[PDB]
Amino acid sequence: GLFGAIAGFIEGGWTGMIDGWYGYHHQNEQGSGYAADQKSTQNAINGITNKVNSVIEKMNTQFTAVGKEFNKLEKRMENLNKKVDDGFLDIWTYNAELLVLLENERTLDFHDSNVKNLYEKVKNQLRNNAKEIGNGCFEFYHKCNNECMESVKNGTYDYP
Amino acid sequence: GLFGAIAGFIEGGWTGMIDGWYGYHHQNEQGSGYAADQKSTQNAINGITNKVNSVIEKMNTQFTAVGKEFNKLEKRMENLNKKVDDGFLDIWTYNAELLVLLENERTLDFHDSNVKNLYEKVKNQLRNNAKEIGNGCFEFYHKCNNECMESVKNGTYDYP
Amino acid sequence: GLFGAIAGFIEGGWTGMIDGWYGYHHQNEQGSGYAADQKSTQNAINGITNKVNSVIEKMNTQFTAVGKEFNKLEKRMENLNKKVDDGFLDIWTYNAELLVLLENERTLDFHDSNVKNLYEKVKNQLRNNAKEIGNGCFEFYHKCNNECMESVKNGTYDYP
Amino acid sequence: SDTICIGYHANNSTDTVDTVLEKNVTVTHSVNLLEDSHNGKLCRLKGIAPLQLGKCNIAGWILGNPECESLLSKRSWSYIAETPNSENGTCYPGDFADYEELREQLSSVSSFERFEIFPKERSWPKHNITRGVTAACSHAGKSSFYKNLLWLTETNGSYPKLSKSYVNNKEKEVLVLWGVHHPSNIEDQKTLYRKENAYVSVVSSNYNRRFTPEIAERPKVRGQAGRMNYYWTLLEPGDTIIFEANGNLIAPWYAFALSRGFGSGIITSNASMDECDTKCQTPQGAINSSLPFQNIHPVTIGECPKYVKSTKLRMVTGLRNIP
Amino acid sequence: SDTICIGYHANNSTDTVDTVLEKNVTVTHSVNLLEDSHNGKLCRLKGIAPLQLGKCNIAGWILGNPECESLLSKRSWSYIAETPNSENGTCYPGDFADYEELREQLSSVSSFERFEIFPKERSWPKHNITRGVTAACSHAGKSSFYKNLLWLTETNGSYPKLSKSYVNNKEKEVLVLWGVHHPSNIEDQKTLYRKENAYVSVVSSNYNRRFTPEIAERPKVRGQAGRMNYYWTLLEPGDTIIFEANGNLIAPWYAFALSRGFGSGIITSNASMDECDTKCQTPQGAINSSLPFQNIHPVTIGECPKYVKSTKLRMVTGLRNIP
Amino acid sequence: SDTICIGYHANNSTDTVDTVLEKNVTVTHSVNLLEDSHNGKLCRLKGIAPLQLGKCNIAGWILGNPECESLLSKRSWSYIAETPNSENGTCYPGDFADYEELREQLSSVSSFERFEIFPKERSWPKHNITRGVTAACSHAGKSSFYKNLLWLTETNGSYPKLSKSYVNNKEKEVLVLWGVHHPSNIEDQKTLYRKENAYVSVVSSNYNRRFTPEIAERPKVRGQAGRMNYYWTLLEPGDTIIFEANGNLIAPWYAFALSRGFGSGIITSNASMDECDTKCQTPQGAINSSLPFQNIHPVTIGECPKYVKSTKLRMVTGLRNIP
Ligand SMILES: *[C@@H]1O[C@H](CO)[C@@H](O[C@@H]2O[C@H](CO)[C@@H](O[C@@H]3O[C@H](CO)[C@@H](O)[C@H](O[C@H]4O[C@H](CO)[C@@H](O)[C@H](O)[C@@H]4O[C@H]4O[C@H](CO)[C@@H](O)[C@H](O)[C@@H]4O)[C@@H]3O)[C@H](O)[C@H]2NC(C)=O)[C@H](O)[C@H]1NC(C)=O
Ligand SMILES: *[C@@H]1O[C@H](CO)[C@@H](O[C@@H]2O[C@H](CO)[C@@H](O[C@@H]3O[C@H](CO)[C@@H](O)[C@H](O[C@H]4O[C@H](CO)[C@@H](O)[C@H](O)[C@@H]4O[C@H]4O[C@H](CO)[C@@H](O)[C@H](O)[C@@H]4O)[C@@H]3O)[C@H](O)[C@H]2NC(C)=O)[C@H](O)[C@H]1NC(C)=O
Ligand SMILES: *[C@@H]1O[C@H](CO)[C@@H](O[C@@H]2O[C@H](CO)[C@@H](O[C@@H]3O[C@H](CO)[C@@H](O)[C@H](O)[C@@H]3O)[C@H](O)[C@H]2NC(C)=O)[C@H](O)[C@H]1NC(C)=O
Ligand SMILES: *[C@@H]1O[C@H](CO)[C@@H](O[C@@H]2O[C@H](CO)[C@@H](O)[C@H](O)[C@H]2NC(C)=O)[C@H](O)[C@H]1NC(C)=O
Ligand SMILES: *[C@@H]1O[C@H](CO)[C@@H](O[C@@H]2O[C@H](CO)[C@@H](O)[C@H](O)[C@H]2NC(C)=O)[C@H](O)[C@H]1NC(C)=O
Ligand SMILES: *[C@@H]1O[C@H](CO)[C@@H](O[C@@H]2O[C@H](CO)[C@@H](O)[C@H](O)[C@H]2NC(C)=O)[C@H](O)[C@H]1NC(C)=O
Ligand SMILES: *[C@@H]1O[C@H](CO)[C@@H](O)[C@H](O)[C@H]1NC(C)=O
Ligand SMILES: *[C@@H]1O[C@H](CO)[C@@H](O)[C@H](O)[C@H]1NC(C)=O
Ligand SMILES: *[C@@H]1O[C@H](CO)[C@@H](O)[C@H](O)[C@H]1NC(C)=O
Ligand SMILES: *[C@@H]1O[C@H](CO)[C@@H](O)[C@H](O)[C@H]1NC(C)=O
């Protein structure tokens, strides 16, 4: 979407990847399978959980009895009390809804960025020994066994 | 600006493109003209209107008579009422000012992102059949007629 | 982080560069040194300063005496006042905490974006006269003296 | 050689918005969020026109100050609007009990009928009903008095004790108002009521109060050294109010059968009436309530946008205008 | 030929969240922020159970209306809950002074003992202690009166002046309530109190009020044309309260030693009580206070999440679900 | 081979900020948003020094309790500060009418002159002006009384009815205070005022109240079983106030010509007064008003940053510090 990876050149998700949020799908002469990149998914699992807890845990609320009672000659104080309740009601409703609306878009942007950086991490490693098919895949020009595959994910891919 | 396209390597806007928000400018032996990419701009026209509609329409307001009247021996209630009006005034003014500044920054970042994704979509399609001029333009190494041009905008550019 | 430059392919910072926020480190036979790109750092110093002043100066506050006094037969007025004070306290506390949390994340994204755009400005100029090492450096294929170095930072790199 | 380029829109627009990083950014398309203007007119809220008082405030209007125009037809209003030149209230000096509370409760009514609760000519057969005029409440150069109250005085040398009752045979509340006169000296107290120590007692099922006149020399207000305190009560449907008096009773003459509505308010406005419908009323005029914020006035009535001290609030929809 | 691809997660989830650019976006994992339900039960705040009034409201319960169950132990409560069918208050018509204020102060107590402040059987040797009953407060077809007050009347043809004092030897506040009776005619005043002009005087170190009975014919309420107004005061530790009366005194019989707590409130709820602990009580029932927002009710008691008019508030944690 | 690299700043800084995704993030440069400290001194708001009462509270200072320092010159103050050791108020026990309201209205004045409204030595030729002392208001071991009031008593066996008037020839409001004495027994009432039934009447153009003494034995406060209720009124420019009394009048001796200011308040502070200027005053001390938030105290006076329960609020300006 915002970083062009998820809604973009990587057209869809992997139901086959149950291990994490972002990962790889390799295909070599030795076999094939899905594997999650625990380095990327953990930083997002950490960041998103820290974000969700910040919305919940930052709510400092004291002991309060909201209701107040007034009699026939205290209508003004009664209406002043409703103004306080409806004012807080209008404020909290508006801010809560927009907070969820704005910060949900950012969470999706956050995932898109992590996906974009992972693609960019592989492209910089596989500088030019493979053709970028444009859909998130890289077709190797040389035989890349499971050791060479695991070395791409590990971040230690030798250039030749 | 934030994605480097609008305030960056695509230095300026096209008053000649009246058809939409983002698009292409082609030049071949068959002619030259401006065309908008309605697929990308419509998703942006939809999202921004949904953004603006959320800000305006989520304002749930009930019926209220703000003013309250007090007499010479009710100044405390009058000042307590002044505290409620000035308090809501401070909250709304501060949040309203900041919301418009922050979300305007995001909207311009949003447009910046849509242009860069469109640029990157063309770059990925043409791969190396054209030279990247660096200003948002691609000089084709082959003759690209109108059929070849329309296929770039449609998203179906054949590589051979 | 979000654009992959600071926590990413440029793994660390330069304590040697005291002149600005972003800059260059050149290495040729003529010498070596750190230099800040005053064009990019100034735009960030300007943008951040306008952001910091918006949070501080948009706080329009009038004269107010918070305290209210009530007697033994005015406990309800006292609790309504406590509700007004505690209500504003919850709103400001909650909004202030999240405001710092959300906009600090954006400020760090802003620097990350400024760093990647600066890298991309140099890469676009040096098209293929240098190898992109993947760590923020360019290894020149030709001898680039200090005159050529000042031109890369200045934006005036002749291609042939 | 052939080329294709990627670019974005630009126009003749001069709209500017503020961002968090940069002020005064010229953009192509933008939308306003701040309601900035009013129409300068008092409009109808909830389709109901307001009650516009002219020379009189709520006190003078509800008591019947001789300078206020009466609405002898059954009425209703969504809010009350009085002018900055509404200086006619209680023309005879005194204290109006719970006046602000009464103002807040008459602010919105769905029905309002003024009716003769105690017909002047036959409710007081053993008291004088024509002497109760005063120069303080003068109309057209002759002395007069409130149009909804009656100043009972002695006749044939006596002021007998009275006991007049009213049962609320209406199917709604009945606002009943009355006054107690406190003379300036004991000699005028004997002249008007033929007793030194009198009493007024007004009772219902929920109202129970006794008033004893306090005689003392006071500064003259509107030329009067005496005072009259004004009191009211809302008499519930089916309930009875009983007036028992020894003297000094400013008896009710007209009352008001009414049904109060969801609380509204009062605006003070130099603005005029128009045949318009609005959802939000400002003392300066009516405003559009579609935008979320307004900066016209903080004291509004209706379903109103939140008041802000801001002068410009616009959201960018288009791009940076870079021609 | 070998390949490697970069991708992201997808699930069977059907959760949708709203974003600023797009509504109803299908996501893989999400968390709810809006507390949406209650348990339909009254629970204990700070581990203390509420005071549940049934047939009576706070007035009738504190006065001792014959239809209310009395407190026989050293009770305590975190809030007060009264039923929509709590219509038994002052069975004898009158005004309860500062009633709403007394309710706000009795809303939370940590100790509460009912004790004989002026024992009926030994405190009034020269007054009648049995005549003070009325058909307005009838129980089981016979006339009665409040269980915590005593209606003193004449005996042997006289009502001598009384002066009864109480010293607060408790180490807490003592709520003392009493009443002042207002007959309908001078004959009823002479029968009960053997004088036309009586007075009631209640004094402490901070309280000083004299009550004069106002005699007048009023409409009948609960069959009674007379009224008796009700009064109370909180007597500080070590302070003395003195009742001095000529007649018309509804003398205190029981009072309440109490310790008031950090201000709570009263909910009106037909919901039933359960053996549960909560941090937030709603008139419909208790709610979980973990989430920052709730839409159950705006009137809450406890350590509560803020009330919003929203129906859906959840934050996405996962990605867009694109299977 | 030659190289050019792109990089960013790093320094020795150890400032940490919180982000929404990560806590305790070390950054290069940052700015604080939360005001964290005070100076421990009471400062001047709007350049005007506060009125700091020492041994006395507002009650004792305005009445003239013998332990309070008097104002010699025409003064002015932006707010009032009283000490936790301010226990000298109404040394003769009684009720102060609308005391909290008088405190709110005297909180800020722009001019304040104390003047002899009714000179003691020449205003009361036919009453005793020297007997009015009491051991409850003793100064230096001898009996004394309020310095701004006069306790009139009988002379030659009589207390004739008095009528002293004051016309407000000043061009500002005049706060007038007075008292009504309520003896403990009829013997003290006869001794001091030579009447069983007396009355006090205070009237103006907008103030109208008559006071009847209530005689009853009460618990002793400061050794006194009697009480004095205290009353006040703001006399508008040009208006005349009239005192009429049979006895029990605690007559005004000094009054106050004053001009009230934009509503302020009262802080309780053991902190000392200093020659400092602030835009925001906290009971513990003055704070800088540059930052948008402060966590010192919720009860402030002035143009103050919003109070938050936060402990750390700083925005990052620089980058992540990676040395
Ligand atoms: C309906 O409202 C209109 C206006 O909205 C009322 O009309 C105005 O009424 C006032 C009051 O009568 C009148 O002002 C008086 O004009 C007199 C000359 O025509 C003056 O002699 C009089 O002066 C007194 O008040 C001054 C206040 O500044 C004092 O400074 C002055 O000393 C006078 O006071 C004497 O009077 C009192 C007793 O009243 C005495 O105790 C004092 O010691 C002193 O001796 C007023 O200024 C306006 O001229 C009227 N204006 C208009 C346009 O009509 C109208 O009366 C209202 N009608 C009803 C029925 O309520
Ligand atoms: C505890 O609460 C319960 C429940 O609320 C109480 O029980 C209710 O008691 C009331 C009595 O007040 C009873 O209603 C009355 O029934 C009477 C017998 O039929 C009626 O005569 C009486 O009518 C009067 O009120 C009507 C209301 O509009 C009038 O229209 C009617 O005319 C009556 O008004 C008076 O008129 C004349 C003078 O002209 C006078 O002579 C009459 O006697 C009358 O006084 C009421 O309808 C309810 O039915 C009871 N409900 C239940 C469920 O039992 C109970 O009393 C409370 N106990 C305590 C101790 O507080
Ligand atoms: C101004 O305030 C001071 C401080 O409260 C007053 O002094 C106090 O006076 C009271 C009595 O009025 C003292 O309490 C009594 O003490 C005596 C023995 O000392 C005892 O017999 C009583 O039972 C009671 O406990 C109190 O100790 C005393 N405190 C101090 C610090 O002196 C002073 O009277 C006030 N002055 C005026 C004019 O209001
Ligand atoms: C009611 O009072 C009025 C006013 O005092 C009486 O009318 C006055 O009568 C005298 C002498 O008869 C005339 O000089 C006045 O001009 C009259 N004044 C008015 C305003 O008419 C009237 O007679 C009294 N009526 C009763 C029944 O007591
Ligand atoms: C108090 O007054 C009541 C009157 O209600 C007395 O009770 C009555 O006593 C007489 C004779 O003593 C009987 O004929 C009545 O039947 C009684 N009525 C009731 C309702 O009991 C009572 O004795 C008086 N008590 C005192 C101590 O004087
Ligand atoms: C006012 O009261 C004072 C005090 O009661 C009177 O002064 C007293 O006069 C008697 C008579 O000689 C003396 O025995 C007392 O010793 C005096 N008291 C004091 C404190 O000195 C005074 O006479 C009364 N009258 C006037 C006009 O002051
Ligand atoms: C904003 O910029 C325009 C030109 O772009 C200028 O005419 C105008 O005065 C500026 N306004 C402010 C408030 O800076
Ligand atoms: C949201 O999308 C789902 C997709 O299946 C649809 O079933 C549902 O009705 C939609 N809800 C709304 C409110 O549009
Ligand atoms: C009642 O008063 C009469 C008066 O003569 C007296 O004889 C009788 O003893 C008194 N009764 C009581 C119980 O005091
Ligand atoms: C914040 O992080 C640093 C990292 O070196 C750590 O030393 C410090 O203890 C942390 N903060 C606190 C309050 O412990």
Numbering used by the authors:
A (entry chain e), B (entry chain d), C (entry chain a): 330 to 489
D (entry chain D), E (entry chain E), F (entry chain A): 2 to 324
Excerpt from the paper describing this PDB structure:
HA is a homotrimeric glycoprotein, with each monomer composed of two regions: (1) the head, comprising the receptor binding domain (RBD) which is crucial in viral attachment, and (2) the stalk, that is responsible for viral and cell membrane fusion in the endosome. Following endocytosis, HAs undergo conformational rearrangements due to the low pH of the endosome, leading to membrane fusion.
In addition, we also solved a 2.0 Å resolution crystal structure of the refolded head of A/Fort Monmouth/1/1947, which appears quite similar to the lower resolution full length mature trimer structure. Failure to bind correlated with an insertion in HA between 146R-G147 of the epitope, whereas sequences without an insertion bound the antibody. Our other IVA HA structures all contain an insertion near the C05 Fab CDR3 binding site that appears to prevent antibody binding, via either insertion of an Asn which becomes glycosylated to physically block C05 binding, or insertion of an Arg, Lys, or Ile into the C05 binding pocket. It is possible, for example, that the glycosylation could be accommodated by movement of the positioning of the antibody as was the case for the S245N glycosylation site of H3N2 viral neuraminidases with IG01 antibodies (Ref PubMed ID 36543789).
